[PDB]
Amino acid sequence: TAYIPGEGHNLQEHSVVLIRGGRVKDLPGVRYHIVRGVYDAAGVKDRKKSRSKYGTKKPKEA
Amino acid sequence: PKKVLTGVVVSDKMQKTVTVLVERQFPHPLYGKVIKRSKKYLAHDPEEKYKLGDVVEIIESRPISKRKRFRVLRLVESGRMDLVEKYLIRRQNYESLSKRGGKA
Amino acid sequence: KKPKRNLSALKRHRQSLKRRLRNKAKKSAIKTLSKKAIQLAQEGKAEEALKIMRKAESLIDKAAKGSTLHKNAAARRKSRLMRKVRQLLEAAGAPLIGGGLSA
Amino acid sequence: MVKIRLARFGSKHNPHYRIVVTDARRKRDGKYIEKIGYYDPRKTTPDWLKVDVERARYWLSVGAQPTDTARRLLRQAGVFRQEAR
Amino acid sequence: GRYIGPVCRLCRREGVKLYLKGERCYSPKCAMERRPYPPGQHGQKRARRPSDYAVRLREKQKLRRIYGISERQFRNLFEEASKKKGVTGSVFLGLLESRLDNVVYRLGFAVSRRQARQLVRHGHITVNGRRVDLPSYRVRPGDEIAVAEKSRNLELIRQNLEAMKGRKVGPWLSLDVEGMKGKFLRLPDREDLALPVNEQLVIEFYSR
RNA sequence: AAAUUGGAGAGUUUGAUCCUGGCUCAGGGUGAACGCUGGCGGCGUGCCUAAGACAUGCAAGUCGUGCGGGCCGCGGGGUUUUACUCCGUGGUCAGCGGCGGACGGGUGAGUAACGCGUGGGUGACCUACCCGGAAGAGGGGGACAACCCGGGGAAACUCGGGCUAAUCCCCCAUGUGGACCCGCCCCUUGGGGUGUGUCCAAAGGGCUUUGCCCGCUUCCGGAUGGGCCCGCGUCCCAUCAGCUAGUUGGUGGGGUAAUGGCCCACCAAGGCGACGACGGGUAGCCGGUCUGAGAGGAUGGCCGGCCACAGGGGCACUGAGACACGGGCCCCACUCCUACGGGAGGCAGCAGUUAGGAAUCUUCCGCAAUGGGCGCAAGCCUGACGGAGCGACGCCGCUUGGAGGAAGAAGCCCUUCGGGGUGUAAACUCCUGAACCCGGGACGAAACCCCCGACGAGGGGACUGACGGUACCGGGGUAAUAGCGCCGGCCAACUCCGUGCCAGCAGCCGCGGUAAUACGGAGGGCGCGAGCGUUACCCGGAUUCACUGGGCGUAAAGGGCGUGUAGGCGGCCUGGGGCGUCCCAUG
RNA sequence: GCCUACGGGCAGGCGCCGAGGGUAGGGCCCGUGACUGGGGCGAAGUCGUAACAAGGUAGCUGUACCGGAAGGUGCGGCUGGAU
Ligand SMILES: [Mg+2]
Ligand SMILES: [Mg+2]
Ligand SMILES: [Mg+2]
Ligand SMILES: [Mg+2]
Ligand SMILES: [Mg+2]
Ligand SMILES: [Mg+2]
Ligand SMILES: [Mg+2]
Ligand SMILES: [Mg+2]
Ligand SMILES: [Mg+2]
Ligand SMILES: [Mg+2]
Ligand SMILES: [Mg+2]
Ligand SMILES: [Mg+2]
Ligand SMILES: [Mg+2]
Ligand SMILES: [Mg+2]
Ligand SMILES: [Mg+2]
Ligand SMILES: [Mg+2]
Ligand SMILES: [Mg+2]
Ligand SMILES: [Mg+2]
Ligand SMILES: [Mg+2]
Ligand SMILES: [Mg+2]
Ligand SMILES: [Mg+2]
Ligand SMILES: [Mg+2]
Ligand SMILES: [Mg+2]
Ligand SMILES: [Mg+2]
Ligand SMILES: [Mg+2]
Ligand SMILES: [Mg+2]
Ligand SMILES: [Mg+2]
Ligand SMILES: [Mg+2]
Ligand SMILES: [Mg+2]
Ligand SMILES: [Mg+2]
Ligand SMILES: [Mg+2]
Ligand SMILES: [Mg+2]
Ligand SMILES: [Mg+2]
Ligand SMILES: [Mg+2]
Ligand SMILES: [Mg+2]
Ligand SMILES: [Mg+2]
Ligand SMILES: [Mg+2]
Ligand SMILES: [Mg+2]
Ligand SMILES: [Mg+2]
Ligand SMILES: [Mg+2]
Ligand SMILES: [Mg+2]
Ligand SMILES: [Mg+2]
Ligand SMILES: [Mg+2]
Ligand SMILES: [Mg+2]
Ligand SMILES: [Mg+2]
Ligand SMILES: [Mg+2]
Ligand SMILES: [Mg+2]
Ligand SMILES: [Mg+2]
Ligand SMILES: [Mg+2]
Ligand SMILES: [Mg+2]
Ligand SMILES: [Mg+2]
Ligand SMILES: [Mg+2]
Ligand SMILES: [Mg+2]
Ligand SMILES: [Mg+2]
Ligand SMILES: [Mg+2]
Ligand SMILES: [Mg+2]
Ligand SMILES: [Mg+2]
Ligand SMILES: [Mg+2]
Ligand SMILES: [Mg+2]
Ligand SMILES: [Mg+2]
Ligand SMILES: [Mg+2]
Ligand SMILES: [Mg+2]
Ligand SMILES: [Mg+2]
Ligand SMILES: [Mg+2]
Ligand SMILES: [Mg+2]
Ligand SMILES: [Mg+2]
Ligand SMILES: [Mg+2]
Ligand SMILES: [Mg+2]
Ligand SMILES: [Mg+2]
Ligand SMILES: [Mg+2]
Ligand SMILES: [Mg+2]
Ligand SMILES: [Mg+2]
Ligand SMILES: [Mg+2]
Ligand SMILES: [Mg+2]
Ligand SMILES: [Mg+2]
Ligand SMILES: [Mg+2]
Ligand SMILES: [Mg+2]
Ligand SMILES: [Mg+2]
Ligand SMILES: [Mg+2]
Ligand SMILES: [Mg+2]
Ligand SMILES: [Mg+2]
Ligand SMILES: [Mg+2]
Ligand SMILES: [Mg+2]
Ligand SMILES: [Mg+2]
Ligand SMILES: [Mg+2]
Ligand SMILES: [Zn+2]
Fold this sequence. Notes:
It is classed as translation. Keywords: protein synthesis, translation initiation, ribosome. This is part of a larger assembly, with chains A, B, C, D and E. Chain A contains no helices and three strands. By secondary structure, chain A is mostly beta strands. Chain C has a single domain, classed as CATH 1.20.58.110. Chain C contains three helices and no strands. Chain E has two domains: about 1-95 and about 195-208, Ribosomal protein S4/S9, N-terminal domain (Ribosomal Protein S4 Delta 41, Chain A, domain 1, Orthogonal Bundle), CATH 1.10.1050; about 95-195, RNA-binding S4 domain (Structural Genomics Hypothetical 15.5 Kd Protein In mrcA-pckA Intergenic Region, Chain A, Roll), CATH 3.10.290.10. Chain E is built from eight helices and five strands. The structure holds magnesium ion (85 copies) and zinc ion. The site of one magnesium ion has 2 residues of chain D, from loops. Chain C binds two RNA strands through helix 1, helix 2 and helix 3.
């Protein structure tokens, strides 16, 4: 089991995803995170800050 | 230089051959104490001349049998059973040390 | 469906078989003929055993000059054969011919 | 057969060779018997060829047939030249 | 690349004058002359005491910023300076000062260190008769650092050498104003350079 | 491994405190991958996984100056029905023969081993081609391909008959010399000499033909490359403690270049193990590399050295050399052809296909260079190699401007409404001129060869560039990519707004339940910059396996107590030995 | 059977060793897995209240028996037991 980071996602019963290292202290038995923006894991929409850590590409006209 | 070691006879029981027990001291590669490791060499005795308890010199040699790669070089000092005892008792104790069992 | 050709490799194999045969022949000639030798010495026939031992000796040296044996490998068998013969005419009587043997 | 040949030691587009004695069969840049001077084909320096004659002379004296470019370089430092009358 | 961006500002973050600018860094305009506090919304507010890291860090930056230079080029020199027989604190500055970009500025061909890097890179500089345009090229003693025969006529080239009318050049250097040549004589001993840096703090920052 | 050149810590158990102690972080590194971003060059470097399967193309040939002939032709001759036939010659094909194919290239499966490292031994040995020295090449005969003729098979291929050349094969002679038995002399494991007996050589080709060049034979030494053997070093588990019967030794015999249970026969009952045998697990080893104050840990692609394998397992044949990756024979598994009798194949060579995977490149150029094979040479071959291509994968270098320019426009942000901030930043002024345009344009390449000279030395001459119209030079010439992490503490960087134990952050302690410097956005700042972060892994921090350098009354830790085996350790004086130890010289 | 110089050679035939396979019988290591043991957890509730104060029967401990469990008692031991 893998944490899905980000304010809101789109994961489902057959989503193909990619996972990395990184535990979550609050959720025990979770020693992997899901990488966002690869396979079937969208980047966060609307994210304007730590974007590379959430697969969001740099928006124009900002 | 063909190697030359010095050691003691611990075995008659072979045809034209003796077991020689050779000691070597050296400082421990990390803890630097001097440690006393040892080895057994099988040495060609073409004349039975060397008896057990003999300290002998032994020399690197054209291969004799599977294990025999040394010839007995000369006698250093004969009659020296204390050493041989230490070999045998070290051996005897091995039959303890087991796990199939022991006695009283 | 075409086993790609390597003309000069096969040619080598072609030759190897040729040689193999030539080599067998010389070798075997020695075997049976050296056997002829040692046999006829155990029947104390020094006029004949040495007659052979020399034809044996020659045939041996010939397959050395070629590539059937090594100069040592031949030499090895000459020592087998010759000594194995002298030490068979102990068990009998004097070396007639003189043959290939020295006294 | 032993040879006297060149072993490349430069970079890419920076060939720097090394004159050497080695068994015919070894990798162009492999374990070599003895080094006998360097050679720099681009002549980036006033000293783009050294040889150590007397050694090379020794090795030729026991028949270390040298490659063609090597004979040339050897010849140039006069490994072969005699004297006088 | 190298740092391009607003400078009288680092002038201000370091709280001392870096002379990154040029003709006005000397005038009543360096904003150190007008707003000696650091940039940003908060530079007005009273400071917290610096951590040891803080002081070690900033003293590094002050020195580095003075000289142009990327941290990767900077650290690599401090590295080289430690591998030297010498007092690395000093050896470092000597190495820094050996940069063509810098040698040129110290020579007085360029108004500033930044302007100097262009003068180099756009090919306006001779080193020993030849062209050089790497601002990182190391000048050794005995080197002659000239203006290109071509670029001899620039306004700033001539305008700057006319300030040399009344400046005099560093003690480890020699200027040939008329001939537009300068010679690099020896490495500057620590006492020649009078930067506002505590080199030792830099060293300390790197031994963490 | 030549200045003692070298050594930083912090958070977290409590209401507080000191100690113990674990957790965690900052550093450096990568054959990396993933996110956001991505302008240029130089040098490196790029299947870590399935040692899975592989379409296609190339990857080792060469010599006509060893020898005969087929096919297609050219000339030029002699001649019995105008058919035959002699000579020279071009092109092509393979065969016989010599040399190479054992090097070069790939890979890391296996292997914990004399495999590797390191130092030695070989009186126990081999070594094609090269080098030096000594000697010789005299007679005679012989077979198989090619080729012609004929039969089996679907194919792959295959059997039979007949002709024949050679540097191919074979017998006789000379034997300088060598080999073998036997005896003697020195030496000492099978070393050197010596004496009778025996036994052993050879090949021819080319021309600038009464002597030069290439090759042949036996032998002695050099040279180089290998076989074999021994000392020492070589990971984890004792919750693997006993292992072994060709096992351990002998005598004889076989085999080999040579020692040896390496193999075989007979005889003896040995061999190894707590200094860890045997068993299980894991791993190619090193020069080095990463880290570290060191000591140590970790690692061994790329370069170089050794090893091992070439779809799994056997096996030997040719030969100087293999038990041979692109050689052979058999078994198995796989794939394809098939007329169901049978046959074909082996990228862990270069490039590429495919699967697997987080992930790893062009079916490119060139034989100009260096190196290798064959050749008298010209040359042929060479996916060795020299280069280009693709990938910020790494390091390094370069750019996106430079100078001037307000008590400081706008917009955005904060505001105590006074003002503060971005910010000389922008605008705007001058200056420079990456890109790009035109022109020139490389070094790497001078030998092989040919000529003079002697075939030597030495001198003269010509041919040859993949990269590449590249680098570099000269002239012209445009202001001309910036992004990413971070801002509660460690830790450089602070404000507003939204949100309200939600959404979320989170390496650790923790944050968020209406004033959040910790979530999210914004302004502002810090840190690096064609890069920045993330994950994974090594070393560090971790004196947290403590050799350097730790402990055990209560923190984890003294065996319940004794006896005593192996082992470890051990008083005072004198003398010998010189093993440890220390010093010098040398390899 | 083939060749021959009559010395012998070649094909072929047999035999040992032998990869591999067959039958029986052991030992070992991974894949899956019917049925199961507790255990640690993890949101604040059930029924107790054993321990911490002499915790309201001083506490702990080995070993027994009872109890589903917490615990109770027996026999010793310890003070790390309060006036
Ligand atoms: Mg290039
Ligand atoms: Mg070799
Ligand atoms: Mg506590
Ligand atoms: Mg607290
Ligand atoms: Mg450090
Ligand atoms: Mg890192
Ligand atoms: Mg992209
Ligand atoms: Mg693959
Ligand atoms: Mg691989
Ligand atoms: Mg193929
Ligand atoms: Mg020839
Ligand atoms: Mg013709
Ligand atoms: Mg031909
Ligand atoms: Mg190889
Ligand atoms: Mg094992
Ligand atoms: Mg060695
Ligand atoms: Mg040969
Ligand atoms: Mg030969
Ligand atoms: Mg010779
Ligand atoms: Mg001669
Ligand atoms: Mg026939
Ligand atoms: Mg011949
Ligand atoms: Mg002798
Ligand atoms: Mg003869
Ligand atoms: Mg003839
Ligand atoms: Mg037996
Ligand atoms: Mg024997
Ligand atoms: Mg392995
Ligand atoms: Mg340390
Ligand atoms: Mg080290
Ligand atoms: Mg290792
Ligand atoms: Mg390699
Ligand atoms: Mg390697
Ligand atoms: Mg394969
Ligand atoms: Mg195999
Ligand atoms: Mg091969
Ligand atoms: Mg092999
Ligand atoms: Mg292959
Ligand atoms: Mg490939
Ligand atoms: Mg896939
Ligand atoms: Mg060549
Ligand atoms: Mg290459
Ligand atoms: Mg690049
Ligand atoms: Mg990337
Ligand atoms: Mg850079
Ligand atoms: Mg304002
Ligand atoms: Mg400006
Ligand atoms: Mg202009
Ligand atoms: Mg050229
Ligand atoms: Mg030239
Ligand atoms: Mg010339
Ligand atoms: Mg040529
Ligand atoms: Mg002439
Ligand atoms: Mg051009
Ligand atoms: Mg220009
Ligand atoms: Mg211009
Ligand atoms: Mg612009
Ligand atoms: Mg930090
Ligand atoms: Mg701070
Ligand atoms: Mg965040
Ligand atoms: Mg934070
Ligand atoms: Mg925030
Ligand atoms: Mg901002
Ligand atoms: Mg910013
Ligand atoms: Mg440690
Ligand atoms: Mg200690
Ligand atoms: Mg402790
Ligand atoms: Mg306690
Ligand atoms: Mg305790
Ligand atoms: Mg006690
Ligand atoms: Mg106890
Ligand atoms: Mg004792
Ligand atoms: Mg003692
Ligand atoms: Mg004592
Ligand atoms: Mg004494
Ligand atoms: Mg004494
Ligand atoms: Mg002494
Ligand atoms: Mg001593
Ligand atoms: Mg010592
Ligand atoms: Mg079997
Ligand atoms: Mg209670
Ligand atoms: Mg109570
Ligand atoms: Mg009660
Ligand atoms: Mg009861
Ligand atoms: Mg009681
Ligand atoms: Zn300023």
